[PDB]
Amino acid sequence: LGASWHRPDKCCLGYQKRPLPQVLLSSWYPTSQLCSKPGVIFLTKRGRQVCADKSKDWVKKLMQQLPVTAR
């Protein structure tokens, strides 16, 4: 059975390379502390998720524009 093995929490080494508008975004949740280079994954209203590092520019604005999502 080859579905998808190996997956500790999440860890998103890769990030996005394009700025999205908050007009359709919702919030953002932080990664775990067990990854090589963990940043933050966003979660649009009905779109999809996006691995983005706060170090970016457009991601920084969103971080302040949106509160957070974690439960």
Curated annotation (Swiss-Prot):
One of its GO terms (biological process) is immune response. GO terms for molecular function: chemokine activity; CXCR chemokine receptor binding. The keyword ATP-binding does not apply. It is found in: Secreted. Keywords: Cytokine, Disulfide bond, Secreted, Signal. Disulfide bonds join 11-35, 12-51. The keyword rRNA-binding does not apply. GO terms for cellular component: extracellular space; protein-containing complex. Monomer. Interacts with human chemokine receptor CXCR4. Blocks infection by several different human immunodeficiency virus type 1 (HIV-1) strains. This occurs because vMIP-II binds to a wide range of chemokine receptors. May form part of the response to host defenses contributing to virus-induced neoplasia and may have relevance to KSHV and HIV-I interactions. Belongs to the intercrine beta (chemokine CC) family. This is Viral macrophage inflammatory protein 2. The gene is ORF K4. The chain holds residues 24 to 94 of 94 of the full protein.
